Amino acid sequence: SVPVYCLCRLPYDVTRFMIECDMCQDWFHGSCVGVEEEKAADIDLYHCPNCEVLHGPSIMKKKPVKTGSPTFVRELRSRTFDSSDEVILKPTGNQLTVEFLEENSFSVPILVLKKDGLGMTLPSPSFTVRDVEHYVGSDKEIDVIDVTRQADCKMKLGDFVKYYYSGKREKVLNVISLEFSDTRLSNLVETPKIVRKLSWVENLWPEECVFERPNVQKYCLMSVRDSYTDFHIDFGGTSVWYHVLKGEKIFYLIRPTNANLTLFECWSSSSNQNEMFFGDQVDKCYKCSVKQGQTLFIPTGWIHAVLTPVDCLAFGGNFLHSLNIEMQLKAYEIEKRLSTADLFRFPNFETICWYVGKHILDIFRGLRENRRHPASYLVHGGKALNLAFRAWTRKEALPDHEDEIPETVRTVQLIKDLAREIRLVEDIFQQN
């Protein structure tokens, strides 16, 4: 059951520019309806050829800088931001423990200056993109971002490498989607210990289970000078570990307050999106520099953009965890409302949530049996998760969700037992 769009009735293709018709609510390829990317901006409310004859032409708007343009990057480099030093935590590798994260529910970015203590396995700083080719494969196809166009393209890793070491770059290309978990490069990399300890998939995804294991923990980032990735929330509301092996990366971090999340969603569905810097709309946009050998950890829901000031090679990944389950679910709902294609969503997000629910149940019961109670964040998360469980299993909604429910899970019993456990803890928390 694959959805199709446009006049051509084809399944989604992330390499082609698409716009939505307000009347239809269907999406159309720019080339299929004669709308070039450069002129799309002038359109506020687009009317497709059909809707046009039946309900009038498109609504036009009304110089503006285009996000990702060389002019945009220069202006960004000169913008004044808030100092991330006033909010980001700087534990040492050995101080970054689960207990440390629990103190504040891993609610703010964390920057670790030296890998020592991070339990991270990586090749030496002398590793080159050319070495990535040798380990990944010259003929492998990868998603590459044409920064000037803020569009995704597909090419052979080998082709990208040629462009990289090329004595000329007429285009600003950036590779940020190369997940190498199933290549030999995977043998030379181990994600930070803290990531593997918190990761839902790492700890709760069973062997086989009829669903393919989500692999989003090992990505290789190869970005040329001036590459720019616009503001976003990583898929599934995952947290991010980011290690700069060579070069430097600049992050623009915005806290996921209810106001900023609303502002973000409005911005993500605007007709102006590519003509406005989202950073100008929030009260605080923190600029964080991550240099060679340093590792940045981005919390759940944090909105961020990324500038590459110099050629850079980096490793990073995404992971879901239990410190802010409600925020992960919020990110998930935002993706749905924005009609996000699956390749930009956490794979089998709901399935892993069910396994987590079962696990959280055992923890609650386990803690109660050992005369102990769970941390408050777990209760809040367990509750928001149980609410989602109920929403996904309601008579009228079940058809769109049953498919992701593991066979080894009794939804009714899980939901009831979790509600019981949570409620108990809430009573005890009320004593004090």
Binding site: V14, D230, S269, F346
Partner: peptide, 14 residues
């Protein structure tokens, strides 16, 4: 105009 953003980190999805 309302356009789908593609300059993001992909997961392969489906």
């Amino acid at each position: 105009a309302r356009t789908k953003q593609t300059a993001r980190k992909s997961t392969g999805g489906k």
